[PDB]
């Protein structure tokens, strides 16, 4: 359609002009103007928790856009999914996995 190809061209022009704007800004900044330890594993733990719960979040993302088309049995399935998610979260909290302080 003409409207969808107009929106595609608008999005492409938006991306190109934004990239060109920031690149030209950096180029003008460079051109103008004269010249003259072992980290603690809690970082890995919190990033790993973010990865796992982001995958669980993607499952809930897929569920949320089709809640009406899934019916009450989909609600029961997603309630079991969310309950397992919350049991894992309670497990992580209670063993001090999510406690940054010692």
């Amino acid at each position: 359609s003409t409207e969808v190809i107009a929106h595609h061209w608008a999005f492409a022009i938006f991306l190109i002009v934004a990239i060109g704007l920031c690149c030209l800004m950096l180029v003008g900044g460079w051109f103008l103007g004269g010249r003259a330890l072992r980290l603690s594993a809690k970082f890995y733990l919190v990033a790993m928790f973010f990865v796992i719960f982001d995958v669980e979040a993607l499952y809930l993302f897929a569920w949320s856009t089709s809640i009406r088309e899934s019916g009450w049995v989909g609600f029961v399935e997603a309630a079991i999914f969310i309950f397992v998610l919350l049991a894992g979260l309670v497990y992580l909290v209670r063993i001090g996995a999510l406690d940054w302080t010692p």
């Binding site: 103007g33 004269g34 010249r35 003259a36």
Partner: protein, 197 residues
Amino acid sequence: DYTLTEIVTDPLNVFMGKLNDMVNWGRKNSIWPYNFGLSCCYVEMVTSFTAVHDVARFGAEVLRASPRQADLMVVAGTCFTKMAPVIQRLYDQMLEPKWVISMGACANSGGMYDIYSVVQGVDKFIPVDVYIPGCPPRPEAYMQALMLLQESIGKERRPLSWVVGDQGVYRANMQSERERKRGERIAVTNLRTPDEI
């Protein structure tokens, strides 16, 4: 009457002059001081930064903890012998263009502390653009020094680009404020008696 870094004349096409004026306007209207606390003079500096004086009105409130982003180094305090290499390193970490304001008698000359552990003025090892007498200078003296620095910045010539043109920095030789205000200062006859408020 300029100074090239030698006493030379004014090097300033007419479009290059307008571009230099625009650059100087943008530089003097956006001055970012470095957050550096030495002694009591820094307390009066940050007092000028607060609401009752509002140094933000001149565009000079963005107080940076990083010397890279700062344009102005205000040496506001005594230049102790242990702190002098720190001051020199923080000045060296800055980028062109950079300006220096000595605030207070300690930073000017050492002040009352002509003592074994004090460097007698910060101009002993870094170049200073504006000096403020006082111990401490009041906040509006720091504002007046900021306007003096702005007036000095607005009449200096710097290269627009590092690949085109003369790369030397031409700083104007301003008339001294003492000679400028001698007309109005000597003409003073009577002041208010100290017994009043």
